[PDB]
């Protein structure tokens, strides 16, 4: 992407060793980040040292967007390297100058936000929907470890139709295909016809 | 606000009476709305026909931006007028033009997408996390339907702790409490301690 390269060439590129902390909750927000490689966890820590993960962000995602539109904000949360990371940084002021010169870089930042909203809104429904989603996920992990599963470079590959999944967990063909699609979008599987690759099953 | 006025003059205004329907789930998205006056309900319907209100938008809120960034996507929710509303509208293709001459109108839209992203829950979980989420959801359904549950104006209410849920599903109280917070934010339950209200279910 030329609009991205052109953006990058105005940024300071920083390398974060894995599990180092890029952002501390409470600090003044002045920098926009973009992830060149690697991945991060957005998280919250209580006073006892218990964590909750709010979000994972990966290559292509920005971090800090809201701070671009609301000057003088504190960091809402910590951000931690989930793997070694390369991360491009630019000040909010400088990014605001790039915007005036090239409205495209803001469309890139906005699209990236829209796709994150779309992907997470595929999971949303009521408690019966979460229940059926969980039972599908659990079926896919079980199948991944049965003797008919095949070793695949990304995980384990299995063969099963939407109809059979629906009979195992009790829902329609349609509700199954909706949930496998939410799962691919979460990058937890890839699916083509009846071939499903379940990622990360060793 | 000059930026909003200059944008409002490039839009057609339409008046929408209460309970009218601005946006239909699944129809082609090619238009951006902005609320000039009034409020609206963003919603989905379950497998039978019950409604789950995702959110309320009010005057000054964009609606329907998601199609702007992506090849012909379809509306992902219904949008309905809660009070009567005056609503500005403009085609995607025309709005992208306004962006090239005036990015500051994109900044207005993009700031709202960013505030929403920052409050959006349910963003994370691999298959095993979805499984334990689904089982917690099914456990709240089971409990709320049991012969000892108490009625409540918005669903059923049960007395149960995080640790007790954990014992039923096999996981730690901490993992239960994290998932209950996500279920709260989704407006599915209220779980402010030792009583959980499971909405809309008996
Ligand atoms: N608070 C919060 N921040 C998130 C979330 N997901 C991604 N982030 C990003 O993490 C950033 C942390 O610093 P900021 O508060 O500036 O901006 C936050 C966001 O851009 C989330 O679910 N909650
Ligand atoms: N799906 C969904 N849409 C929302 C939500 N909040 C606001 N919206 C708006 O509802 C609109 C539905 O049509 P779009 O998909 O075009 O864009 C969506 C958003 O602008 C929400 O929580 N979920």
């Amino acid at each position: 992407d030329p609009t991205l390269e052109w953006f990058l060439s105005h940024c300071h590129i920083h390398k974060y060793p894995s599990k180092s902390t890029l952002i501390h909750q409470g600090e003044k927000a002045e920098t926009l980040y973009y992830i060149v490689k690697g991945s991060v966890a957005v998280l919250i820590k209580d006073e006892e040292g218990k964590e909750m993960i709010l979000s994972y962000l990966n290559q292509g995602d920005f971090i800090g967007e809201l701070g671009l539109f609301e000057e003088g904000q504190e960091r809402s949360a910590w951000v931690r390297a989930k793997t070694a990371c390369e991360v491009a940084e630019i000040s909010y002021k400088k990014f605001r100058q790039l915007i005036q010169v090239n409205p495209d870089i803001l469309m890139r930042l906005s699209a990236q936000m829209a796709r994150r909203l779309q992907v997470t809104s595929e999971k949303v429904g009521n408690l019966a929907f979460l229940d059926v989603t969980g039972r599908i996920a659990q079926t896919l992990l079980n199948l991944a470890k049965q003797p008919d599963a095949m070793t695949h470079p990304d995980g384990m590959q299995i063969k099963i139709t939407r109809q059979e999944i629906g009979q195992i967990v009790g829902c329609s063909r349609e509700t199954v295909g909706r949930i496998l699609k939410m799962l691919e979008d979460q990058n937890l599987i890839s699916a083509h016809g009846k071939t499903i690759v379940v990622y990360g099953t060793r």
Side-chain angles (χ1 to χ4, degrees), chain A:
Chain A
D1 190 350
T3 303
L4 290 154
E5 314 211 334
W6 167 85
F7 158 56
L8 292 172
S9 75
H10 296 94
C11 295
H12 307 306
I13 312 275
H14 286 22
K15 300 198 218 156
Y16 283 93
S18 179
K19 279 32 180 196
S20 62
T21 296
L22 283 77
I23 291 184
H24 301 70
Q25 178 179 86
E27 80 202 352
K28 46 287 157 52
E30 300 171 352
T31 309
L32 180 73
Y33 303 74
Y34 170 95
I35 296 169
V36 188
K37 199 181 150 63
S39 82
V40 303
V42 183
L43 68 79
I44 292 315
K45 272 231 284 263
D46 63 24
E47 312 287 304
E48 274 174 55
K50 297 209 186 48
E51 297 167 352
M52 192 183 42
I53 303 296
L54 305 178
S55 182
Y56 298 112
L57 300 168
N58 301 103
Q59 25 207 121
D61 294 346
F62 283 85
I63 313 162
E65 305 87 330
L66 180 60
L68 176 69
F69 316 102
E70 310 185 353
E71 310 178 2
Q73 251 49 8
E74 286 188 292
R75 298 299 196 194
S76 67
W78 286 259
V79 180
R80 182 170 70 217
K82 176 177 168 187
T83 60
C85 269
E86 162 187 16
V87 175
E89 318 195 351
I90 180 178
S91 73
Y92 286 146
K93 305 176 224 273
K94 176 154 186 86
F95 188 78
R96 275 191 298 259
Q97 290 165 3
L98 299 192
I99 295 180
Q100 293 304 318
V101 172
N102 187 354
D104 280 339
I105 188 51
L106 187 58
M107 293 280 305
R108 277 326 180 271
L109 179 147
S110 295
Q112 169 252 194
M113 292 200 292
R115 174 61 173 188
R116 283 145 61 193
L117 286 169
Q118 300 223 170
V119 148
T120 132
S121 72
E122 288 173 349
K123 301 174 53 167
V124 165
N126 68 13
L127 296 165
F129 181 75
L130 307 177
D131 158 63
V132 75
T133 296
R135 288 180 293 111
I136 289 172
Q138 173 52 228
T139 293
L140 297 168
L141 302 161
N142 297 341
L143 288 164
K145 79 210 200 304
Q146 302 298 30
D148 59 340
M150 272 192 232
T151 292
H152 175 283
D154 293 323
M156 296 298 294
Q157 175 182 280
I158 59 174
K159 250 126 219 284
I160 189 162
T161 60
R162 291 168 204 199
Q163 185 191 172
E164 337 169 22
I165 284 161
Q167 284 151 6
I168 283 161
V169 308
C171 67
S172 72
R173 172 155 268 264
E174 290 74 13
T175 285
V176 176
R178 187 175 162 200
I179 291 168
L180 305 180
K181 186 200 167 51
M182 178 275 280
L183 297 174
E184 304 188 81
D185 281 352
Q186 289 301 132
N187 252 78
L188 305 175
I189 64 182
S190 74
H192 327 282
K194 91 186 167 265
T195 303
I196 295 156
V197 175
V198 177
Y199 299 148
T201 37
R202 294 171 317 127

